[PDB]
Scaffold this active site. Sequence first.
Site, short mmCIF file in Angstrom:
data_model
loop_
_atom_site.label_atom_id
_atom_site.label_comp_id
_atom_site.label_asym_id
_atom_site.label_seq_id
_atom_site.Cartn_x
_atom_site.Cartn_y
_atom_site.Cartn_z
N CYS A 93 9.63 5.42 -17.44
CA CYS A 93 8.64 6.29 -18.06
C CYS A 93 9.00 7.77 -18.06
O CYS A 93 8.45 8.54 -18.85
CB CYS A 93 7.29 6.07 -17.36
SG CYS A 93 6.96 4.32 -16.98
N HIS A 348 2.35 6.97 -26.06
CA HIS A 348 3.36 7.03 -25.00
C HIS A 348 4.55 6.18 -25.42
O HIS A 348 4.72 5.07 -24.92
CB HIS A 348 2.73 6.55 -23.67
CG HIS A 348 3.67 6.45 -22.50
ND1 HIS A 348 4.78 7.26 -22.34
CD2 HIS A 348 3.63 5.66 -21.41
CE1 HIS A 348 5.38 6.96 -21.20
NE2 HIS A 348 4.71 5.98 -20.63
N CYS A 380 4.08 9.21 -13.68
CA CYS A 380 4.41 8.05 -12.87
C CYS A 380 5.47 7.24 -13.59
O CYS A 380 5.68 7.41 -14.80
CB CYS A 380 3.17 7.18 -12.60
SG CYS A 380 2.34 6.58 -14.08
N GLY A 382 7.34 3.30 -13.81
CA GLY A 382 7.39 1.89 -13.47
C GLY A 382 8.48 1.57 -12.46
O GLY A 382 9.56 2.17 -12.48
#
Lengths: 403, 402
Positions: A93, A348, A380, A382
């Site tokens: 991400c 996103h 954040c 993954g």
Amino acid sequence: SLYGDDVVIVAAHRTPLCKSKRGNFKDTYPDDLLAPVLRALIEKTNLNPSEVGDIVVGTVLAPGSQRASECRMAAFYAGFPETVAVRTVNRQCSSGLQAVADVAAAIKAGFYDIGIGAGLESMTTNPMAWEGSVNPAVKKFAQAQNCLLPMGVTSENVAQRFGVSRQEQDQAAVDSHRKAAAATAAGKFKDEIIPVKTKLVDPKTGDEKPITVSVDDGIRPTTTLASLGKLKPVFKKDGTTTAGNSSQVSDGAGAVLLMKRSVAMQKGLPVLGVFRTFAAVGVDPAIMGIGPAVAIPAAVKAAGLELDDIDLFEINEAFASQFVYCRNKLGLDPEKINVNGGAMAIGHPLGATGARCVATLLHEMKRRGKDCRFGVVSMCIGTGMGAAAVFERGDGVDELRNA
Amino acid sequence: LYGDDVVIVAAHRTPLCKSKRGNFKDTYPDDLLAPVLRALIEKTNLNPSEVGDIVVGTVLAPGSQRASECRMAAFYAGFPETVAVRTVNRQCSSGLQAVADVAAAIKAGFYDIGIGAGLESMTTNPMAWEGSVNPAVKKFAQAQNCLLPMGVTSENVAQRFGVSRQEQDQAAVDSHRKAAAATAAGKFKDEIIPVKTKLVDPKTGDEKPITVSVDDGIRPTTTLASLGKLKPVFKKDGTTTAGNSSQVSDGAGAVLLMKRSVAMQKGLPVLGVFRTFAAVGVDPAIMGIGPAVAIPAAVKAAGLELDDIDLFEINEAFASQFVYCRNKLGLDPEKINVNGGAMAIGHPLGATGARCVATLLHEMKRRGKDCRFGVVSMCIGTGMGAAAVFERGDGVDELRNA
């Protein structure tokens, strides 16, 4: 650290971000999303593309080799010569922000003086799905097993562990759409956005028609607590994570042109921002959404600053659960975060987000004036990480306006 | 011995094995990477929480899955959740790029210690395009040329620069001969981390525990005659064969880098010093020329001349381009791939650039102070070259107990 050696941003741009599969980039190849933003960096600075030392593209979901090839092809489309190298990077991400940090590191290290950090994702093109088997040996390492959790399950874990209610989550989503709609209407994305000329193909008929895409097509001005309240949990029967309080699945790209300050000065290029610090830290994969709560302090501390010294934040809205948690945990002023909306409203595209957010952050800091001196991009990640970068507002805009 | 130099305190690799039929055919990618990550921290007695990032060069797999696999490998290796991980892809150079990225990050003040690694399981991940090609490629010749088979670019180099079948096959003969001799002399013992894994017998179907400790692709009986039997793979009239191309392989490499001052504080002997790195673009149609452009760039940047380089690890992607680069640069053939190269021991794409840092530095160590400067370099699919200059470390000479 000498002034002339600062790594400066002289341009930062993005495509609109569009809903995957059904949105305006559904029939657009990944290379056709990246090429426009690469070309824009060159054209807006009048830079000879041969002077670019590397093009580093954060991108997450595609087979590695094919996507790195597509990035090379995009650079050719954008008018770059064969001499400019290209590569991709993947920290899930955070990839688009990682790319920018890589370029900053390379410039600081003396590898080259000018580079492009970009981000790219077509979630239309590339599904999020594991291929083949999982090593059975993963049974021996609980944290490795937790890397396999669906992102949405980690969202539920965060909401449950830290007591983030359904209403708090939905309210954050309502706020995101409100702010994104307001920013769009106020012209606040005009500078960062590079319109993309592409086409739509009717699957029913086969007909094609051209379209120029200039706005983020995921924004829904009618989003309310009531509408969001009707949505059902996606990952857990009695859960609180829904499509409406999660980031949108999206297509798009972003790109940032960085160089040594001394080079920008020699070229007479107005400085948009200054790269200061970057942190990428590991956290429990089962609650990966806490990433920013750890990464932001790390990057801010590295910069010699305190949280109160940061004037603007782009904290990715992967899930309202974790976004709300991080905001509260760090005690941040909600009015300083995602002021033009975030991923719940505008989407996103994984690899694009970190790079496009640098554009969103810096152009907003530009408009807010000299008092909006420090900004942070954070997200954040993954598998359990957080990344954050601190940027300083450039003075290029002021020098031009008061020339 | 400037305190801010980026030094290598350990560099190791798995054996490299033939894909699909070799000894790692039943080994998951995470189980190739974990052993080398673990070795770096065991051999230096370093608490893994002190590592600022693990950067893994790896090429063929779906991006997210493989980045996940790398995090899993770090956990298997005993790293805590606090240590971040990522992957990089510059095709064939990815493993070396990872090392360079760690050096850049340390130089930039991002952290003081990092791991640059490389990983590929070509058993697991095929080299095949997915989905359609953008019709726009037809309008940009150089973009279109990015889609050429690597093996076709090999033919382009051999034909354009006049590299004969015999010259190509001789390089392969030499590679196997050197690899065989190095293995027998134990010259890979320092760099290799043996891997404990499982192998399914292709004939019986039984599963047995094995420890893999040597590169299984070496063929000491390779001759000009044996290579001559081979048919061209990419063109009906080609000179590129399986025998004068790199082997398709599985393996991993990893390098532990830190600020010199930190190595000194910890009393860790220095294996090598990172000096420079270049990644340059070239014509995709003749991508094999990469090193002929990248090596001069990296050497120039280091303040050196080509003659100053004592040892080279130039990847044997194809004998065609390997020979071309060697000849173009006028390099001493005796100083290149002295323990054999990818034609004999293999080329797991992402692993090569990292494992070659180990091969290079351990040989420079054994060769002594005269072997002061070395280069790792390779051509890169889609038309690039990369090269890094390293300096031989002084090892125990710089320690408190010297």
